[PDB]
C-alpha cells in the first residue's frame, strides 16, 4: 500500500573499503548531502577519506593528520582540527585558506552555512568566517545547565538572530537533553530541556510576513513531547503563531529511545524526526499532527543532513548504510486522506503547498456547504481550489440554480463577489457576471471593473455590452485584442484618425478602400482627410490609383484635385 514517504538506500560504506570501526560520530562527519568525510588510520598512518556523493564510486584517500575534519556544505573546502590548532584548507587548490589557534579546546564544531563554521569550547560558542582574515567571533557564553554535557549539535535560524546549542548527559539511566536558546537581539539565553531541535520559516494563513518558528522534540519530564513555538516579536501586521505542544510516541518495547535528529522541510511544511533506535517520525509543522511513524533502521543513525534536492533528510547509520527519507509528493495527500483518515489536514495541506490529490474532498466540502445553505462559505471553497478545480462552468450552473430571495440575494452574486478578490475572472465568468448587470439599466459597475482590470475579455462580451452602450464596448474590444471590432467602433462613430493610428500600432491591415467608401458615403469632407492619411511615405496603407477612382465614383473632382495637390505639398 501507499506511504507518504520515499525511503531510499543510497550506498553501503562497507562497499567502499571503509572500516566498520570508523563508522561513528567521532570519526565520520556529514555536513551536507554532498560529502561524507571519514577519518581512518592505515598501518600507523592517519588519513582522511572524502566521498563525493555525486561520484560515490571513487573515493579520495588523502594523507591528513587531524583529530577532526568537516567539509563545507557545498565547496570543496575542508576544515581540520589538530589539537588547539584550527585550519580551513582548500582541497582543490591544495592550499591553506585560514588558520587559528584556540586558547581553550574546541569540543564541538559544525558548518553553520557555506563560509561559516561554528566553534564550541567548554565556556562559549564562536562563529568563524571562511572569508577574509577575520578571527573567530564570540557569540555567547555557555549556560551552566549545559556544563558536563556532550555537545551533539548547534543550530541557527535563517537570519541568524537565534542560536541553539544542544547537549546530552546520562542522568539516572536516562539520556537527558540540555539546550540553550540564545537571542542575538535581546542578548539573553533560555535553558530548555530538549533532545532534538530545528528552526523554520512559516507564513501563516492570512499573514503578511513569514514567522520564525522554533521546533524541538524531547523525551523528558512530561514524556515524549514535540513543541512548535514562534521566536520573538511578530512582524508588523501579523497574528502570531499559537504555541503547539504534541505527544511523541515511543512504543513499550523502546523504553530507552529518544529523539536524536530533526529536519524541517520548508517545501511541504513538515517535520522529520529520527530517534536513537532508528524510528522516523513525520509531523505537520503547522499543527504538530503526526502523519507517519516507522522504523527505517536497525542501527542508530548518528549523522544527519538536509537532503536539499528532494527537501528531505539524509543520514548514515552505524551499519554503514546511507539512508534517505523524503516526502512522496504524489502520495502524501491520498495517504493523509485515506490511510490516516484526516481529511481536514489533507485539505489544509493541498491548499497550503500546491499538492494534488485532494479533489474529491473539495467537491464534498462544496456540496455539503451548498446543502447547508451557507453559500457564502461554499463560494470560498470553490475560490481556493488548488488548481482551479472548482472554478468551472458547472459551478456557476449550480449557483445559477438558486433564486433571488427576499433581499438576501444572490448566491451566484456572492460567488462572483469574492472571486474577483482573488485574481482575474476568466472569459466565461466575466460573461455570466455582466448579463444580469446589463439587464436592468446598470452599466457604471463595468467602468470600475474594466479600469481595475479585474476581468478577462474576449469578443463575446464586447458585442454583449455593445447591445446597450457601444462606447463602453470599445473599451472591452480594446483589451480583448480583436482589432476588427475596434476599428469597426471608430468607423461607426466617424473617428477616422484613431482608425489609422490603431491599425498602425497593432499591425492589423483592414480593407482601407471599403472604409474609404463608407466614409465618403456618410460624409465626403472627412473622406478627403482620410484619403490623406492613407498615403504617406515608405509605407502607404492604400493604393493611390484606387483611392482616386473612389473619388470619381462620387464625382468629387474638385476635392480629388485638392487631395492630390495636398499630397504633393506633403511630399515636399
Amino acid at each position: 500500500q501507499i506511504l507518504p514517504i520515499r525511503f531510499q538506500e543510497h550506498l553501503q560504506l562497507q562497499n567502499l573499503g571503509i572500516n566498520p570501526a570508523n563508522i561513528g560520530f567521532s570519526t565520520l562527519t556529514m555536513e551536507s548531502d554532498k560529502f561524507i568525510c571519514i577519518r581512518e588510520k592505515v598501518g600507523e598512518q592517519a588519513q582522511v577519506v572524502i566521498i563525493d556523493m555525486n561520484d560515490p564510486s571513487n573515493p579520495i584517500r588523502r594523507p591528513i593528520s587531524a583529530d577532526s575534519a568537516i567539509m563545507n556544505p557545498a565547496s570543496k573546502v575542508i576544515a581540520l582540527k589538530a589539537g588547539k590548532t584550527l585550519q580551513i584548507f582548500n582541497i582543490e587548490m591544495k592550499s591553506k585558506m585560514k588558520a587559528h589557534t584556540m586558547t581553550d579546546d574546541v569540543t564541538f564544531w559544525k558548518w553553520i552555512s557555506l563560509n561559516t563554521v561554528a566553534l564550541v569550547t567548554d565556556n562559549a560558542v564562536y562563529h568563524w568566517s571562511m572569508e577574509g582574515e577575520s578571527q573567530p567571533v564570540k557569540m555567547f557564553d555557555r549556560h551552566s545547565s549545559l556544563a558536563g554535557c556532550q555537545i551533539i549539535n548547534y543550530r541557527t535560524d535563517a537570519k541568524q538572530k537565534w542560536l541553539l546549542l544542544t547537549g546530552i548527559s546520562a542522568q539516572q539511566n536516562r539520556v537527558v537533553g540540555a539546550m540553550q536558546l540564545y537571542s542575538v537581539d535581546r542578548k539573553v539565553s533560555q535553558p530548555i530541556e530538549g533532545h532534538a531541535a530545528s528552526f523554520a520559516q512559516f507564513k501563516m494563513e492570512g499573514n503578511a510576513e513569514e514567522s520564525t518558528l522554533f521546533c524541538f522534540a524531547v523525551r523528558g519530564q512530561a514524556g515524549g513531547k514535540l513543541h512548535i513555538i514562534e521566536v520573538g516579536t511578530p512582524p508588523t501586521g501579523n497574528q502570531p503563531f499559537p504555541k503547539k505542544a504534541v505527544d511523541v510516541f515511543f512504543p513499550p518495547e523502546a523504553q530507552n529511545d529518544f529523539p536524536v535528529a530533526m529536519q524541517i522541510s520548508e517545501k511541504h511544511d513538515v517535520v522529520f524526526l529520527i530517534t536513537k533506535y532508528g524510528y522516523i517520525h513525520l509531523y505537520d509543522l503547522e499543527t504538530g499532527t503526526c502523519i507517519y511513524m516507522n522504523r527505517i533502521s536497525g542501527e542508530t543513525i548518528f549523522v544527519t543532513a538536509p537532503h536539499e534536492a528532494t527537501a528531505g533528510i539524509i543520514g548514515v547509520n552505524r551499519k554503514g548504510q546511507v539512508l534517505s527519507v523524503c516526502v512522496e509528493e504524489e502520495n502524501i495527500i491520498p495517504y493523509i486522506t485515506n490511510v490516516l483518515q484526516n481529511p481536514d489536514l489533507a485539505l489544509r495541506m493541498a491548499v497550503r503547498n500546491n499538492l494534488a490529490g485532494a479533489e474529491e474532498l473539495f467537491a464534498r466540502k462544496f456540496n455539503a456547504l451548498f446543502a447547508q445553505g451557507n453559500y457564502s462559505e461554499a463560494a470560498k471553497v470553490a475560490a481556493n481550489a488548488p488548481k482551479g478545480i472548482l472554478r468551472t462552468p458547472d459551478t456557476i450552473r449550480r449557483f445559477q440554480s438558486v433564486p433571488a430571495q427576499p433581499g438576501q440575494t444572490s448566491p451566484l452574486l456572492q460567488y462572483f463577489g469574492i472571486l474577483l478578490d482573488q485574481g482575474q475572472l476568466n472569459k466565461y465568468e466575466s460573461l455570466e457576471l455582466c448579463r444580469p448587470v446589463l439587464q436592468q439599466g446598470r452599466k457604471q459597475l463595468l467602468e470600475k471593473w474594466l479600469k481595475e482590470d479585474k476581468l478577462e475579455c474576449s469578443e463575446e462580451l464586447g458585442d454583449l455590452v455593445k447591445s446597450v452602450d457601444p462606447t463602453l464596448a470599445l473599451s472591452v474590444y480594446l483589451r480583448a485584442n480583436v482589432p476588427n471590432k475596434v476599428i469597426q467602433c471608430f468607423a461607426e462613430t466617424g473617428q477616422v484618425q484613431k482608425i489609422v493610428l490603431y491599425a498602425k500600432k497593432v499591425g492589423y491591415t483592414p480593407d482601407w478602400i471599403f472604409l474609404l467608401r463608407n466614409v465618403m458615403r456618410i460624409s465626403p469632407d472627412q473622406g478627403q482627410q482620410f484619403a490623406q492619411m492613407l498615403v504617406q511615405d515608405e509605407e502607404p496603407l492604400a493604393d493611390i490609383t484606387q483611392i482616386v477612382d473612389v473619388f470619381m465614383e462620387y464625382n468629387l473632382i474638385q476635392q480629388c484635385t485638392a487631395f492630390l495637390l495636398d499630397a504633393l505639398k506633403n511630399n515636399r
Binding site: 479600469k451 462606447t471 463602453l472 470599445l474 473599451s475 480594446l478 483589451r479 475596434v486 484613431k498 493610428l501 490603431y502 500600432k505 497593432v506
Partner: peptide, 18 residues
C-alpha cells in the same frame, strides 16, 4: 514581462477611460 508595459500605453491612447 515586457508585453504588459506596451499594453498600458495603448489603452491610454485609444480607450475612453474617464
Amino acid at each position: 514581462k515586457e508585453s504588459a508595459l506596451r499594453k498600458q500605453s495603448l489603452y491610454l491612447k485609444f480607450d475612453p477611460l474617464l
